[PDB]
DNA sequence: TGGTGGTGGTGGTGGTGGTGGTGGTGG
């Protein structure tokens, strides 16, 4: 997101893509174990992402794409 | 401040309908 967000203020490129937001780790996640909590970073994490990227997109005019993936809710 | 992620198949029911006639013996 970092790289994205550098790419963007320099009003260089004019599409950006990342292949799937279920693939972004949080460092600590990556660092740690298996079997560990992490509860809920990935979900701060993109939300100030998007909090510190709407607006730079709109004034460098990029367009920006992401895919996810299915996952499925036990207990509903 | 901010949500995650689907497990595992179970047990059989009931019987139908009959087809065809051979061969005379003693004065």
């Known amino acids: 997101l970092e790289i ?4 963007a203020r320099s009003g ?8 799937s937001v279920a693939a972004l780790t949080p460092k600590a996640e990556i ?4 079997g560990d909590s992490h509860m809920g970073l990935a979900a701060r994490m ?3 992402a998007m909090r510190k990227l ?3 997109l709109k004034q460098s005019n990029t367009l920006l794409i992401f895919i996810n993936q299915i996952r499925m809710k ?3």
Not at 31 to 34: H, K, R, Y
């Open 54 to 56: 709407a607006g730079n």
């Open 12 to 19: 260089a490129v004019d599409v950006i893509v990342v292949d």
């Open 46 to 48: 993109m939300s100030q």
């Open 31 to 34: 660092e740690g174990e298996i």
């Open 74 to 76: 036990i207990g509903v």
């Open 4 to 7: 994205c967000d550098a790419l």
